[PDB]
Amino acid sequence: AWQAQDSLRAVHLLATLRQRLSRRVPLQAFAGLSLAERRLWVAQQLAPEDTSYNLLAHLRIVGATADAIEQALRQLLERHVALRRRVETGVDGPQPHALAAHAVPLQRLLASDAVHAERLLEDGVRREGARVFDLAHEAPARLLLVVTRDSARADLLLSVHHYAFDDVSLAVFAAELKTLLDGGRLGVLASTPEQVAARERAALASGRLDRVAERWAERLLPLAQRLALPVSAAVHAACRALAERTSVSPFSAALQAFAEVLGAELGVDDLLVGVALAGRSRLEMQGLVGCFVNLLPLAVGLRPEQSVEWRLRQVGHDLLELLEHQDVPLECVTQALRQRGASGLPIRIACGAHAGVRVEADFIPVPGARLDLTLWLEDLAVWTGVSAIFDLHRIERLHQAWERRLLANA
């Protein structure tokens, strides 16, 4: 398990050991629709013409025929029900209904050369970016397959609504596509998006997740344009060294400097920071396709009187607590806060981190921002902010302050 594998890899290590030898180990001492699907679906209902929930994935495939690619995609659509479901509104919750795999639109186009293949792709990007999905009557996914004449390269544009997809789903979809195009076989899936929702309803009914949310509501109660810049090697090394001395993850050190820079910028002593989590809490959710992402709050205290090491231990500790209980939906934390006299929790800032046929898959970023400012680290610092608050030049200034804060803390 060790040789097969960050702190998310630590969760995967503890899950493999739990499946083989039983008994937990709690990470902190070593390091119908689900609510994840529903919160994206209801946000689309409140703004039906908003297309900021359209996910566009570009898959570059080298070494497979058009017939083999199309056939492999029909297999993946049959295998992953989340890409071929319609959603009826319900009296006590939206209700999904499975559709046939052939009902997913698939358009094959032949391009004369590579430049023509780019232009077909760009035209598809603009068309799918402005498209309003009919989530009640059609599948939430479309596919554009562009093959280039006299070339081994084929391009696949996957447009799928966010309620039925996420980042890990793209990696699973791309790897399984490569497996089929190579001639391999896919094992029987151990779960479905519907089973995840059913298990969540049981966990909600047992009060287990709400008790964890009530514990978090204590600390959280007082608080109740895209730019991609490369991180210098000196800042990356200092981030790693600071984490090794503090026994936290390198992401915890980068989150701490992120919250401290923004806290000084906004002039506050405490800053609420969201942490985007993959939300696949059990081993059989690792190979699923759908939406499992869960944004959970993290209260960072900006105490200049305290040491850098102590502030970092608190950040990394609170981070592993959110990682352990990433199955606790954000709505549970909101419910616990309202039960203590709060209108809600106001999250404005967030953070996160990401032989044979060749399959390269990447998302085309979604324009517009729900949150005021986000920082995503790619193993590259991707800053996304609302233009009216965090413009391009203000983001560049914050990234420089973030890099300085990291070097100073180390």
Author numbering: 746 to 750, 767 to 792, 823 to 1015, 1034 to 1163, 1173 to 1197, 1203 to 1233
Extract from the study:
A crucial step in the process is peptide elongation accomplished by the condensation (C) domain with the aid of a peptidyl carrier or thiolation (T) domain. Here, we examined condensation reaction carried out by NRPS AmbB involved in biosynthesis of l-2-amino-4-methoxy-trans-3-butenoic acid (AMB) in P. aeruginosa.
To obtain AmbB T–C with l-Ala, apo full-length AmbB, which activates l-Ala, was used to trans-aminoacylate l-Ala onto the Ppant of the T domain of AmbB T–C. MS analysis showed a mass shift (+71.04) of the alkylated Ppant arm as compared to holo AmbB T–C, which corresponds to the molecular weight of l-Ala. In the structure of holo AmbB T–C tethered with Ppant-l-Ala, chains B and D exhibit relatively well-defined electron density for Ppant-l-Ala while chains A and C show fragmented density for Ppant-l-Ala. The interactions of Ppant moiety with C domain are essentially identical to those observed in the structure of holo AmbB T–C tethered with Ppant. The positioning of the Ppant places l-Ala in close vicinity to the active site, with the reactive carbonyl group facing the donor side of the C domain. l-Ala is surrounded by two residues namely Phe1181 and Leu846. In holo AmbB T–C with l-Ala (chain B), the side chain of l-Ala is oriented towards the hydrophobic residues Leu846 and Phe1181 while the free amino group is in close proximity to His953, poised for condensation reaction. Ppant-l-Ala of AmbB follows the same trajectory in the donor side as Ppant-fVal, placing the substrate l-Ala and fVal, at similar distances to the catalytic His953 and His908, respectively. Superimposition of holo AmbB T-C with L-Ala and the T-C bidomain of LgrA, gave an RMSD value of 2.60 Å for 345 Cα, suggesting that AmbB T-C and T-C bidomain of LgrA adopt similar conformations. In addition, the delivery of the substrate l-Ala, did not cause any discernible conformation change in the C domain.
